[PDB]
């Protein structure tokens, strides 16, 4: 969560009010509600799982409590397979 030149806290979307913008007045004696937790950083932090099969399935964890089950091809050595929903990454060993 970086801070913009005006002193506002830039959101995860990247939204920050420019010095020219008059809409910054809305926070004059109030606060701008920004979620400190950023999805991109946390998803990056997760370790990459290494699986020995060409295709693996991600349900998001918790079965029916997660996301629709999808099968990911891991043939490409260069790039890890990434779940469309979960965002977790997998790659074949070696």
């Amino acid at each position: 969560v970086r801070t913009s030149p005006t002193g506002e806290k830039v959101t995860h979307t990247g939204q920050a009010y420019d010095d020219g913008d008059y809409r910054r007045v809305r926070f004059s004696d109030r606060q701008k509600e920004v979620n400190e937790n950023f999805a991109i950083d946390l998803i990056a932090e997760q370790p990459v799982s290494e699986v020995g099969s060409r295709v693996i399935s991600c349900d998001g964890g918790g079965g029916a409590l997660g996301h629709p089950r999808v099968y990911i091809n891991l043939d490409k050595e260069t790039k890890t397979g990434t779940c469309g929903y979960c965002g977790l990454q997998f790659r074949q060993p070696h």
């Binding site: 060409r54 295709v55 399935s57 099968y71 990911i72 091809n73 043939d75 490409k76």
Partner: protein
């Protein structure tokens, strides 16, 4: 079709192919209709897309790391029945029901291709071809699209 699935086995997955900066490819969604190959051969004239392999492992796309470059390449996005081939610039931006469709004419060229300008909340979201058998059959150039 039926409203339920009797398929109790694991599904197949296909490694995605990169065919350019305009068409986003998720080949696991491909249904091997071969529309893209026939379009590229017949209309575009570029015989670079084809089927490699046999059986359930049959895959559609350049065997090599070739890029499908043509004026009419974007039309494969429209032709593809499934979302295997999708517009990279338009990816994730909007859903079909939201968009308001306005029928208009392109100005990039003098062909006068008829187009549908899709706008949501006052913002242009995409340009889609409109059928005029005389001027543009169902296709538009990459610059128009």
């Amino acid at each position: 079709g039926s409203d339920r699935s009797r398929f109790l086995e694991g599904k197949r997955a296909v490694e995605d192919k990169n065919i350019g900066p305009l068409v986003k490819t998720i080949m696991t969604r491909c249904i091997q209709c071969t529309r893209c190959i026939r379009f590229a051969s017949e209309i575009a004239g570029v015989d670079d897309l084809g089927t490699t392999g046999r059986g359930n492992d049959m895959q559609v796309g350049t065997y090599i790391e070739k890029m499908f470059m043509s004026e009419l390449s974007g039309n494969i996005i429209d032709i593809c029945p499934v979302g295997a081939l999708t517009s990279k610039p338009y990816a994730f931006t909007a859903r079909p029901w939201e968009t308001r469709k306005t029928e208009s004419i392109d100005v990039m060229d003098a062909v006068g291709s008829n187009i549908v300008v899709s706008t949501r909340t006052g913002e242009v979201m995409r340009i889609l071809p409109r059928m005029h058998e005389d001027i543009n059959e169902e296709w538009i150039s990459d610059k128009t699209r």
